[PDB]
Amino acid sequence: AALVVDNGSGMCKAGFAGDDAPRAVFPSIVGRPRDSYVGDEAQSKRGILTLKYPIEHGIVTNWDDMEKIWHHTFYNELRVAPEEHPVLLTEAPLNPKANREKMTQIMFETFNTPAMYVAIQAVLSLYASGRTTGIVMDSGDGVTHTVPIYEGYALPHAILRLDLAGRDLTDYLMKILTERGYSFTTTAEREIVRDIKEKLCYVALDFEQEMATAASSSSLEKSYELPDGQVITIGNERFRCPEALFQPSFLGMESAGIHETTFNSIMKCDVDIRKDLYANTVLSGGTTMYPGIADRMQKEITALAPSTMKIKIIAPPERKYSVWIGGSILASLSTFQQMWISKQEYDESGPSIVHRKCF
Amino acid sequence: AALVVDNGSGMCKAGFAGDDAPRAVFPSIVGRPRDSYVGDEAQSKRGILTLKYPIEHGIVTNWDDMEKIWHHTFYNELRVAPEEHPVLLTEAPLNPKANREKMTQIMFETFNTPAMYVAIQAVLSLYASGRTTGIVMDSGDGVTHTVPIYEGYALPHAILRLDLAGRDLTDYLMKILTERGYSFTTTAEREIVRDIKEKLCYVALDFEQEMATAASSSSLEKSYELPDGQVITIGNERFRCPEALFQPSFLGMESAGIHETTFNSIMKCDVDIRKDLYANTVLSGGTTMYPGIADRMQKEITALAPSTMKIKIIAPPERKYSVWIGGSILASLSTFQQMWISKQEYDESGPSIVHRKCF
Amino acid sequence: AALVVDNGSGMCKAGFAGDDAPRAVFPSIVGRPRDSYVGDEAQSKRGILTLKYPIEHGIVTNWDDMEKIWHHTFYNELRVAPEEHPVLLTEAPLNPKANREKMTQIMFETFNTPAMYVAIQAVLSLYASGRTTGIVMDSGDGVTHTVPIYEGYALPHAILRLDLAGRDLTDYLMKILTERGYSFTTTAEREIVRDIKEKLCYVALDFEQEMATAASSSSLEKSYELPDGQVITIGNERFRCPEALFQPSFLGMESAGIHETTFNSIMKCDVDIRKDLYANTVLSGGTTMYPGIADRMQKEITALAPSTMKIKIIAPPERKYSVWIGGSILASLSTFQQMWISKQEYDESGPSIVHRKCF
Amino acid sequence: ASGVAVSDGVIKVFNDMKVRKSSTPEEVKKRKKAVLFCLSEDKKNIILEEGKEILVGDVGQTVDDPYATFVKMLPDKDCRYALYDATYETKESKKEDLVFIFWAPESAPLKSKMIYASSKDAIKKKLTGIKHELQANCYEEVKDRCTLAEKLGGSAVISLEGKPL
Amino acid sequence: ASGVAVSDGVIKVFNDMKVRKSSTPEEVKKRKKAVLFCLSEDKKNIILEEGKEILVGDVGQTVDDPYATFVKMLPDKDCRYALYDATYETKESKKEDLVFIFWAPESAPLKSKMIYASSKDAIKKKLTGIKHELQANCYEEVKDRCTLAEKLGGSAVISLEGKPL
Ligand SMILES: Nc1ncnc2c1ncn2[C@@H]1O[C@H](COP(=O)(O)OP(=O)(O)O)[C@@H](O)[C@H]1O
Ligand SMILES: Nc1ncnc2c1ncn2[C@@H]1O[C@H](COP(=O)(O)OP(=O)(O)O)[C@@H](O)[C@H]1O
Ligand SMILES: Nc1ncnc2c1ncn2[C@@H]1O[C@H](COP(=O)(O)OP(=O)(O)O)[C@@H](O)[C@H]1O
Ligand SMILES: [Mg+2]
Ligand SMILES: [Mg+2]
Numbered sequence A, B, C: 001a002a003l004v005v006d007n008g009s010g011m012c013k014a015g016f017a018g019d020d021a022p023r024a025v026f027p028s029i030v031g032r033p034r035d036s037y038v039g040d041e042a043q044s045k046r047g048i049l050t051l052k053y054p055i056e057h058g059i060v061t062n063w064d065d066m067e068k069i070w071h072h073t074f075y076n077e078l079r080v081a082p083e084e085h086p087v088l089l090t091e092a093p094l095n096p097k098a099n100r101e102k103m104t105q106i107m108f109e110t111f112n113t114p115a116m117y118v119a120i121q122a123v124l125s126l127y128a129s130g131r132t133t134g135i136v137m138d139s140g141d142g143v144t145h146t147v148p149i150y151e152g153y154a155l156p157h158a159i160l161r162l163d164l165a166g167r168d169l170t171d172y173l174m175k176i177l178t179e180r181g182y183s184f185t186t187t188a189e190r191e192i193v194r195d196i197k198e199k200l201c202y203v204a205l206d207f208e209q210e211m212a213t214a215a216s217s218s219s220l221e222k223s224y225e226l227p228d229g230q231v232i233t234i235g236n237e238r239f240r241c242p243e244a245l246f247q248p249s250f251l252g253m254e255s256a257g258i259h260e261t262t263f264n265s266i267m268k269c270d271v272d273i274r275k276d277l278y279a280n281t282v283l284s285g286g287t288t289m290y291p292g293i294a295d296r297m298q299k300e301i302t303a304l305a306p307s308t309m310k311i312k313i314i315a316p317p318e319r320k321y322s323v324w325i326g327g328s329i330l331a332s333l334s335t336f337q338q339m340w341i342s343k344q345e346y347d348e349s350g351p352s353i354v355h356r357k358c359f
Numbered sequence D, E: 001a002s003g004v005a006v007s008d009g010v011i012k013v014f015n016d017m018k019v020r021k022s023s024t025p026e027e028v029k030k031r032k033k034a035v036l037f038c039l040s041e042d043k044k045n046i047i048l049e050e051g052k053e054i055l056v057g058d059v060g061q062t063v064d065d066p067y068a069t070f071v072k073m074l075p076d077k078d079c080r081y082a083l084y085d086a087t088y089e090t091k092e093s094k095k096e097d098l099v100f101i102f103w104a105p106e107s108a109p110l111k112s113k114m115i116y117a118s119s120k121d122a123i124k125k126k127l128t129g130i131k132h133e134l135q136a137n138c139y140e141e142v143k144d145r146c147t148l149a150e151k152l153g154g155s156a157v158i159s160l161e162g163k164p165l
C-alpha cells in the first residue's frame, strides 16, 4: 500500500495508490503567530498568525516548513505511519537537482520510508491522457507551466514558467468585487472569494462581446450565499476574473497570457516536432477548470499559429487531479514495485541515487 | 467663475475656483426618519432619523442620495445656480468607469452645467506639493488610500485601499472614553468626540514609552469643556486613538497599518521607481493632521525599507484640503478653460466623452 | 571632425574621430506600443511597448527602423547635424553587397553627409591590436563571429557565425537566478540581470572543479544590491552563465562552443596560414570581457589543435570597444581624408561607389 | 494638465542647446550652459527668465564650477524649470547630456507649485530628446554634485564638469 | 479552565484511533469506530466510559448505521465527550476524519454542563490533529446525519458512512 503525495504550490494532494481520488487535499501553508499551524489549522485561526508558502512557486524554498507539511500529511491527513509505506512524490518542472536529493534525504532519514520515488508532475498528466508526446499547460495555485514533452521526456530548454495562477485570480476577484460595494479583505473572506471563483467564474470566448452582453441585461448575473446567510450578486466579474489568464495586464503584469506562453514554448522546440505539439496540447491543474477555457485556448492559439497547423486543446474531465491520479495508478502496479528506491539502495549510494533511478 | 466640489467619503468640500479655502464643508449624509435631510440638517435632528453615507468609502454607491447632496451643495451651501458655472468634480482612486460616466450624465442632464471636469483626488494632492512622481497617502473619513503616481498617472495595480480612517478613530475614541467613566453614545455626543479627537489627539513616536509616561504622571492630561459647560479630562486616550492607524488590531482588524500599506504599495511598483517613491511620500486628508504623524510614518517605513533607501515623508501644512485647493488653482487658470467638457461636446459624444477629455 | 558609428547587434557605439571612447552607447532598439521610441527611451517605458532589433544579428533587417536609430544617434546622442560631418560606418562580416549600397544611399540622401566610409568591424579590431593577419573572435550582444583575416582581408569562406552572445547569456542568467528563489522576468529586471552579469560573472578555468568548490563553501558567493535597496546573493551562477559560451547545450543549442567555432574556422583556411592563425587569435566585443575567458580559450583550443602548434589568445584590455576605437583613430588621420566617399563621387557613380572605395 | 503652453522663445533656445552646429570659437562661447524657464505674467506661457543663464564662454573664467553657480540662480521661494548641459565622464565614455530640472522648493507658494507641476509633463513633451530629469523639492536635493551624478549614470559617473566627485 | 486532566487511558485510545498501523484483518476489526469519554468519580480526570464504544468490526454486522447507534449511546441527562471516526465522501475525495463531539444536553444538571464546558478546551488541546468539532446541546442537533455532514464539509458532502444523504 503505497502513498502518493502531490506537493502543489498552494494545495497538497495526498492519498493511497490504487484509489481514484486523493484522500486529503489541504493548503500547503505553515502559520506562525504575528506556535506552528499547518494546513487547515493555519486557516482556522485566520488573522492572528502570518502564513508562509514553503513551496510557493512549485519549488521548495523553506525545507524546515516543508517537513512540517509532510509530517502533517502523513500523521494528520493520511493517518498512517510513513515508515510502513513506500511514498511516491511529485516535483515541479525545472526542479534543481539539489532539491531532488534533499527530498530523498528527508524521506529516508526523517520519515524512514521503506521505499521512495520521484516523478515529474507534467509527465504524469500527459501519460494520464494517453500520450507520450505533447505539451502540458499546468496551471495551479502559485505557478503556471507550459511543459513540452517528447517521448516521455520534458524538454527543459523549452519549459516556460508563468507566475500567474489561481492565487492571483482569487486576489483579483477580491479586488473587482469591491467595485460592486462588497468588502473581502480578511483571510476568511478570501476563502469565500475562492469558493465564488470556483463556482461562478468562466472564460468568455469573446471578451468584448461578453462585456457588452453583461452591460445590456442581467442574464449573466448569479447570486451567491455567504456563510452567514447574506446573498451577493455577481455580474461581469464572472468572466473578468479568469480573463486575466489571457490578459495579464489586468493585474499589472508585463508577461504574456497562457495562450502566448504555450505558443512561445512550442516555438522553442525543434521545428520537426511542433506539428505534434500543436495537436497535443493538454490542460492540467485546478486553474484550467473554468468552463470555456479549452475553446478559448483553441481560438487564441489558432490566431498565433500558422493556418496550416491543426490546433487541438485536450481538456480531460479529470484534469484537476490528473497528476495525483496518474501517480496513484503508477504506484499501484505490481510491475512498478521494482522501480522504487529502496532504503538499502539509499544506504549504499546516498541521496544521489535519485538521479539514476528516477531520472 | 467655476465651482470646485471635492466629494469626500464623509465630508463634502465645495467652493469657488480662485479662493484659498472651500466655502462649504458639511457632512455628506442623507437622513430619513426612523422626509429627507442633507448635511448639517441631517445632524441637527440627531436621533429621530437614520443616516446613510451615499459615498461611504470614496465610491458612490447610492446615486439618488448623491444627487441630493449635490443639489444641497449648489443651492444651500454655495448658494448659486449650477447652470451658470462650470463644475470641477473629484473622484477617488480606482473609481469604476461607469461611475465617471454617471457623474457626467448627472451634471449635464440634472443640473445642466455649462462645462464639467473630473480629476483624481490623489493626483491633485501630489501636484499641490510640487511633484509629478510620488506616492500619496490619503487618509480621510471613510477610507485610506495609498496611491503611487508616476509622471502624473496613478498606477492602478499598486493602489491599496484601507477601510480605516477618521470615522473608525472617532468610534474608537468613544469606546475608550467610556473606560474613564464618560458616556458618549448618541449622535450628538459623537460630534463632541470628533471635536475632542481633532483638538487633543496626537501620534506618539514611541507608543509603549508614551504609555509609561502617561501612567507615571499627569503631564499628558488635558481638559475639555463640553457644550453644556461640563469639563472632562483625557489622558492616554490622546495617543491611543490615532495609534489604531498603525496598529489596526486595536479595532479588531486583520489589516496592516498605514505605514505597512504605504510600504506594500511601493513594493507593487516597478523596482526602478521605488527609490523615488520612498523619497516622495506625501500625506493628504484630514486624518493625517495629527501632530507627530509624519515623524511616526518616517520611523515606521524606515524600519520596513532597506537601510540604503532615503525615506522622506512630506506633510504639507495645508494637506487637509490639498485636494480642493489643488482643484481650485487648476480650475481658475485661463489656460484651463480649454480643458472643460462643454455641453456641446456632451451632446455629441454622450457621457463617454469623460474618458478621453479627463482620462 | 568626423563621426564614427559602430552599429552593433544590440548596442550602438557613436562618437567623434580622435576621441578615446565613444560619446554615446545606447541600445539599438525601436519600441512601439503593444508611437516610436528609440534607444534608452524605448527602455524607459518598460512593458507598455514591444521592442524590435532592426540589426538583431549584425545584419540590418529593417531599414525603416535602422534610419530611426541613425537619426536618434545624430541628433539626440551625438547632438550634431550629420550634414556637417563625414561619417565612418562599420559593418558585420558577410554583410551582403545590397546592404552596403543601402547604407551609402541612406547616408547621402536621407542625412546628406558630405563624406562617408564603410569598414569591416573585425578588421578594425585586428588592426587595433597591431596585426594584419589573425583570427578575430568577436562576441557581442546578438551574434558571435570568428573572422580569419590574412593581410588585412577577411576570408569569407572561413567566417563562422554563432547566434550565441551576451543577449542569450542574460536570458540564461535570468533563468538560473530563479532557482535561488529570485524572480527576474520584466524588461526592467532584465537590465538588472545584465548589470549583475557584467559585474559578477566570470569564466571558470575548470568548470567541474569550480562547481565542486562552490558546493563545499561560500568563498565564491557575492552580494548585489538592487535599485530598491534589496540585496541578493549569487553563487555558482557567476560561472555557470558564461559557461554556456563553451557548452551551448546549457541553452538547448546543438551548436559548438566559441572555442570549437574558432578552431573550425581556422581549419577552413589554407593549411599554410593555420599556424599564424593559432598564434594570433584576438578577442573582441563586450561578451569577451569576462575575467578568465582568455585562459579558458587558450586551454580549450590547445586541446583541439595539434600539440606542435603554439596557441596564443590575445585579449587586449580595450577590446570591448576596439572596433569603435580603431575606427576613430583611422577617421582622424589627415592622410585618411582622401579615402572618404564624397557626395560628388556619389552623384556620379551612385551607391555602387562603395564597392570600389571601401571594398 | 493646466493647458500652459511653451513659448517659441523657449523652443528656439532648446533647439539651439540640443544640436551643436559647426561654428567659430566666438559663437561657441555664446552657447548656453544653463538656462531657467518661468511663467509669464499672465501665467499663460513658459518663457525665458531674462538674465538667468550661464554661457559656455563663462565657464573657466568668471565661472569656476558651472553647477554651483547654476544652483545659486534658483529662487528660494519660487518654482522654476531649468535646462542644464551636463559634461560628465563615466568609466568608459565622456558624455555631454541635457538635464531637465524641475525646481519646486517647499518654501514656494502653493499656487506656484501647483501650476508648475501640472504643466511640467506638457513642456517636457515639447523638449524632445532629453533623457535626464531632476525633480528637486528642497535646496539639499539640488545643491550637491553627487545628486546630479547619481541621476546621470549612478555610480558609473567618475567625473562631473571636469572634476572628480 | 477547571484544571481537569486527561487520563493516559484516553490519550492511548486517541493515539490508536488517529494513526492506523499495518495490521492483520483481525486487528482491523478491533479498531474503534466511536468512543465516549466521561469524568471520573472524583471528577479529576477525563476517563473512558466503559462499554460505550463501537468497533470497526461491528460495522456491517451487528451495527447497520454506525452514527445512529453512536447517538443512542449518548445519555439523555448527562454530558459526555465523544470521538467519532467519520467515513464520508465529497464530490472529489473519499475522506476519513476524526470528529470530536461535545454532548451537553439541556436536560443535564448544571454542575455537569459547567465542568464539561470549562474543561473542553483543555482536552481538545491534548487530542492534537482533530479538525472537526460538533457541539450538540440537544438531541435534535446530533441525531441527524445531515448535521454531521454539514460540519464535515458543508454541501460538498454527498455520502456519509457509505450511504447517500
Ligand atoms: N473548479 C475550479 N474552477 C476554477 N478554479 C479552480 C477550481 N478549482 C480550483 N481552482 C483553483 O485551482 C488552484 C489550486 O489548484 P491546484 O492544481 O491544486 O494547484 P497546485 O498544484 O499548484 O497546488 C486554486 O487556486 C483553486 O482556487
Ligand atoms: N485637525 C484634525 N486632526 C485629526 N483628525 C482630523 C482633523 N480634522 C479632521 N480630522 C478627521 O478627518 C476626517 C475627514 O477628513 P477628510 O479628508 O475631509 O475625509 P473625506 O475626504 O473622506 O471626507 C474626519 O473623520 C475628521 O474627523
Ligand atoms: N563588462 C562585461 N562583462 C561581461 N559581459 C559584458 C560586459 N559588458 C558588456 N557585456 C555584454 O556585451 C554585450 C554588448 O557588447 P557589444 O560588443 O557592444 O555587442 P554588439 O556590438 O553586438 O552590440 C552585451 O550583451 C553586454 O551585456
Ligand atoms: Mg499542481
Ligand atoms: Mg478625501
Ligand SMILES: [Mg+2]
Pocket: C008, C009, C121, C138, C139, C140, C141, C285, C323
Ligand atoms: Mg559588435
